[PDB]
Amino acid sequence: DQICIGYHANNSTEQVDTIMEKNVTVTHAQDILEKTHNGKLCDLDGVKPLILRDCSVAGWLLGNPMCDEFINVPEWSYIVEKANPVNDLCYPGDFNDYEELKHLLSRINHFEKIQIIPKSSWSSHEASLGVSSACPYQGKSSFFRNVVWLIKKNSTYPTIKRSYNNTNQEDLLVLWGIHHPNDAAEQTKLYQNPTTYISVGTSTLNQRLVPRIATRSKVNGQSGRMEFFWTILKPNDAINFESNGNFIAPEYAYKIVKKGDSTIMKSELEYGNCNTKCQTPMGAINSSMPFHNIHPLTIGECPKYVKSNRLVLATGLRNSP
Amino acid sequence: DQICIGYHANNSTEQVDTIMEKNVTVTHAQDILEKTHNGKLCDLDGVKPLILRDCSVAGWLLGNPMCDEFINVPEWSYIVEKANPVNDLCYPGDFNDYEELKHLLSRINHFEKIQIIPKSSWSSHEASLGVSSACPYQGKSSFFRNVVWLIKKNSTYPTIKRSYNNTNQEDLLVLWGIHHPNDAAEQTKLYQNPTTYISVGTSTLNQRLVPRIATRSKVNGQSGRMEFFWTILKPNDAINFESNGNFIAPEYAYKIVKKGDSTIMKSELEYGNCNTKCQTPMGAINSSMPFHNIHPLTIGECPKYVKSNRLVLATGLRNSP
Amino acid sequence: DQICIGYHANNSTEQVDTIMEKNVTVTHAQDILEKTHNGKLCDLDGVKPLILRDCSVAGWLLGNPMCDEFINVPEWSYIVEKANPVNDLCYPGDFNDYEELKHLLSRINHFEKIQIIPKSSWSSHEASLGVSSACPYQGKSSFFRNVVWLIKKNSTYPTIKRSYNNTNQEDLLVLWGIHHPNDAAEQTKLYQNPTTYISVGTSTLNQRLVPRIATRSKVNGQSGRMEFFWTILKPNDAINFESNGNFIAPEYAYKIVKKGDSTIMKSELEYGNCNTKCQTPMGAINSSMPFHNIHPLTIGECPKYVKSNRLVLATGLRNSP
Amino acid sequence: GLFGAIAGFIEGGWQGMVDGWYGYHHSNEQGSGYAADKESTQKAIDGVTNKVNSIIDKMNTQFEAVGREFNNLERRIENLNKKMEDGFLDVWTYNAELLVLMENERTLDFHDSNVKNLYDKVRLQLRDNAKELGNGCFEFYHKCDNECMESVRNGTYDYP
Amino acid sequence: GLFGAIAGFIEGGWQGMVDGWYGYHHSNEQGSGYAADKESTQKAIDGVTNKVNSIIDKMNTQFEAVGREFNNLERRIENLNKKMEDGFLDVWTYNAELLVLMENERTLDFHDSNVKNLYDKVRLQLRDNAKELGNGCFEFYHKCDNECMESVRNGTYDYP
Amino acid sequence: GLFGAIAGFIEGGWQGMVDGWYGYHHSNEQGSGYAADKESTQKAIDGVTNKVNSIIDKMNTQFEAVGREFNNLERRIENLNKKMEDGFLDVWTYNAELLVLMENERTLDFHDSNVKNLYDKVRLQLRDNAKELGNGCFEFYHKCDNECMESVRNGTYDYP
Ligand SMILES: *[C@@H]1O[C@H](CO)[C@@H](O[C@@H]2O[C@H](CO)[C@@H](O)[C@H](O)[C@H]2NC(C)=O)[C@H](O)[C@H]1NC(C)=O
């Protein structure tokens, strides 16, 4: 008559690592790392992303005429942008402090756009003539839809003195530009006046832009440059423009709905018609796993990212053959 | 006749945590996390902080007339400043490289202020008329005390040409500014000359500033701006000002006694007349605990900060009931 | 008769540390920290570094004439520059975005110097009298070998227009510079024209520099200032220079051969005539240890820096006397 | 195994014991079989369930990367940004991996200890009524039917 | 606990032993009481203090926050700086809390194992002379007064 | 030492077993000497070597410092950069130092656990044929020559 102390075994083929032994078979393990995603871009709590497709953030905010899908877009959870969108600044140039802008954009879910300075309202200057073949729309020369390329009226450019006060209670993002022509005469052809400047004021803005006539690389068949600028106009405060040439006028501004909690991710991926509570640039995550190894960059209720290929816990004992 | 092997109990009610079990009563424990502070700003090894009250660093350095508490102040351990001090640049403007300057202040314990260009010293320009009702002292319009707002004399503003040689063995902080009027009339009314500049040179400095007559919102009833600059004057180097108007002249400068090791902290608290060895923005710490969870920013011999709410070690054994 | 269970001792004197006991003698230990180095700068896998000796990076690239040892240097593994190279900008001044260029140099192993604007080639400007006694070569006043300090020919500085097109498959580093005289006469003497500029352009560059006449300390007995700029020219893009004076034109530019993996390290050390696979600014590491404590900055096949003085593992057991 | 029992002096696990992690096989006159020890099983489950819960929690504070863009002439601070975010992932990955390596070892020794304890409990309790075979098993000197075997299983073997 | 002495084969602590961490209770004709074992207690105290001094030291290197200010259009490197500091704080917090969770466990097991060793010292010495009751206690067959009891305590039992 | 054998109930190592880590001493009528035990030794060598290889790998991701220059008016980011790189070195030095500390403790105990399991292995085997001397050694009652002594080492002692 015998009594024996012993312990569970079973057909588990499951293995865990230790410091002194690798690949130890256990009766019971817990794999705590997510390695699968769905490969799609999905809504985030039923709230679709701004998928800028071929349009760059700049090409959206200025209304590149090839970015008419994004004239006024609904609130978004995150924004998705390609590596190298072909529809950036149609007219070659520079967006000044672009990244510092993007940063704010990254903490913004909604823009409601509104008119600040009407295209009708330019008494003394023409502004339907500011169109470039470099910015085509539907065949015909065009330009950024939210700003206005004012040209001379009857060989005269009278000093502009226009002004806007912010009587919406949301911070207003305001965009303007200058044109640096390529030759001494282009200046004269377009605006008449030889030496020019654009001077921008707010409570905190003290700016005087001045054009930069220089000989440079044809790029999108263009030898001149737009050079765009922006500011946040606090609500109940006025911006004060003034120029005697080269002014790209604000026509539209963006009303901020600072909703908060967003990101611009980099994805050559199309929209995928799904929901998810966690999204990565590579696809969306669905697990209770404490961790995943999909992608460092995620938005939403997410596992912690690690660089491991494998993370598994013993729960049971060494499974003996 | 029995002999038994056993271990200590007691009435300890102290719990400690482990990986496998929480709330384990031990017979002895060592709480190692400090959770208390005095709630006050105190001296740091008998050396009182510069507590800027309602003045901001800028407001102190250029001597806002509302900031007279700090016209000359003794060596400091640390500086305390509020989140939104009311006494800043009274006459609206900017301070330039403000933060890079405040960074230096993080490594300085004592200034000593000395005259470099006396107010009397101006033969051909008036120096008592550059005052503004925005910078009032005692009800009377005044101005930043360490700089001189030079104004035109008998209706001419003759080119300025001044030069200072550092005949102290210290690095020297040197502060100057430029006025940006809001119309060409103010330009004429104040300085006569309509196309001005300021030039400044040291071994390393190569700057020619120039006013920006733009049109802007009233901030403290002012539509002008000052924009203050600064530099570090090596000993046996000379600074070389030159201007035909808009020039806010150095009257004063600060002699750096670079006693090293300091912080500008952000606290709405007043002086508390305590002394201490370790100080945070919420209060000061008196302990030997290796760690603390009061606030991440400290100055002096401090425990290590952690975000824990509780850090207790076993030393004794599981205490049975 | 006795059988006994027992264990190894020996004359091992090796001690290792634990949490609860320090200095525990063990029969066997494995020291895993590298404490030693050869104390020299050595080639890195047969490939000699560029040891700039007294020349600063700036001094090397513009070709300061005390830096002729480096007129065309071969592919290098790493660069060594001293803390305060005596031979920098001979003509006092500033190297614009210097640190951002030194960055690029970090990721570059070979430059090949080529002419892009011959010295002979300047028809309407004198290209040989741009020499200063601050930049001496063999007793005689010289100047930055890779750029040309153009001066007036017969009292006319005709507006410059030159253009270089990159037809190599490499990116090309183009260096130029502007000159800031100290007085009106100086300007007038050297260039004729009193209000001058240089306007530089490529597909991505939109520049217009303007001389900055002010009055400043004699550094190297020179009162003026050079201000050198730089760009990277894409292969098949063209930089389009234009000036009426103050121009320090290109003559040479460097073609990049970007073999990557290099640093600039800082070392008062000379060349050591040795090979290694792991180099620190202090000397090089010949070792198999996982870790070392020599210096944190290394290049090559390298053990991991830690700040420890000692890291010894127990392998054997507590060595009992 | 630190504690000598599992894959030690008990050479293998029991496929037959499907009811708990530690227990008994008794073999006598009326037949035989297995009976899991509920108490140690239930202590072991708890200890392991807290362990894992503790492993999930404490690794929840973790660094969350944030994308951030820098232009052609801001290389240094972008590279700062790179080396910094990569640095934290390496710290947290090192951390998570090494903790798993460590606590997996502690779990295996935990189970080993649980078995050694149970053995020692049974062994003392069988003072000198049985030949400790040295293989997990005790052979009685007297007959020990299902009423008696359960006596040991009970904790209340002890012929008072 | 791993070694099965504390709250294990020995159900509980002794409120009446105020003299040390582990030791003896004896009971015979002349009456009874406690006696703390000096050497095992003293090894426990040294082990435990060294650990606490070790725990304090290896942590003193830790990251120190430092105030840094950034203007309105320096938001990207402000966030960097913020993510950078919160980063090291989460890493040090984790480090410190966990080492405490880990070393706490190891301390308790240490005490468990100190009692177990002390039991075995006594268990051997008492060889064939006492019924190992199995609860911490040995019962002599041959009467054992204070000169004898102190014999075991002394570690110089043995009928040589 | 946790497992109570090394520097425990075995006072000290054997200067004369130059052949392995754990082993046997016999002393009988035909002479006396030492025999290293191959299995426990070889299990220990493997376990330790893995530990070392483990320690080296898992520490191989580790932060690499990259040199970076800044101008007179870039003091904040240079300092950011400095306290960033110093910061990782401190996290890695702690991680490395503590791992050595921790695992050294575990190594020593492993050897302890190994010597113990061997003593426990001999003690079951020798059943009741030998006085367990309390000191590492067992004294047989019946003459045990070299053929007998190898019956113990062997594993095939026990009179069948
Ligand atoms: C922008 O417009 C607003 C509202 O029209 C101005 O603020 C008002 O100005 C009056 C002037 O006496 C103040 O007393 C009130 O506080 C303001 N009204 C409201 C309803 O807020 C504002 O000042 C304008 N911006 C500037 C500075 O030109």
Ligand SMILES: *[C@@H]1O[C@H](CO)[C@@H](O[C@@H]2O[C@H](CO)[C@@H](O)[C@H](O)[C@H]2NC(C)=O)[C@H](O)[C@H]1NC(C)=O
């Ligand atoms: C600032 O003044 C100091 C001393 O008053 C100048 O240094 C002297 O100038 C001469 C010029 O030939 C030097 O050779 C001497 O070495 C200096 N004398 C002493 C006592 O050190 C200094 O150069 C002045 N600043 C400048 C650069 O103009």
Ligand SMILES: *[C@@H]1O[C@H](CO)[C@@H](O[C@@H]2O[C@H](CO)[C@@H](O)[C@H](O)[C@H]2NC(C)=O)[C@H](O)[C@H]1NC(C)=O
């Ligand atoms: C730099 O020179 C190159 C070649 O000399 C120019 O590229 C050529 O431009 C012609 C224009 O008719 C194109 O059709 C060719 O495709 C280009 N050549 C080849 C074979 O690559 C280049 O455009 C010049 N740079 C600029 C912007 O003017």
Ligand SMILES: *[C@@H]1O[C@H](CO)[C@@H](O)[C@H](O)[C@H]1NC(C)=O
């Ligand atoms: C562990 O097991 C895996 C199979 O799951 C195998 O690929 C790997 O090589 C093993 N590692 C070692 C070193 O034993």
Ligand SMILES: *[C@@H]1O[C@H](CO)[C@@H](O)[C@H](O)[C@H]1NC(C)=O
């Ligand atoms: C530990 O004890 C505290 C009471 O002091 C309690 O609030 C806490 O929830 C306990 N933790 C757990 C999970 O048992």
Ligand SMILES: *[C@@H]1O[C@H](CO)[C@@H](O)[C@H](O)[C@H]1NC(C)=O
């Ligand atoms: C350990 O030993 C070294 C000598 O090698 C000694 O300097 C050091 O102080 C010792 N540490 C302690 C705390 O015993």
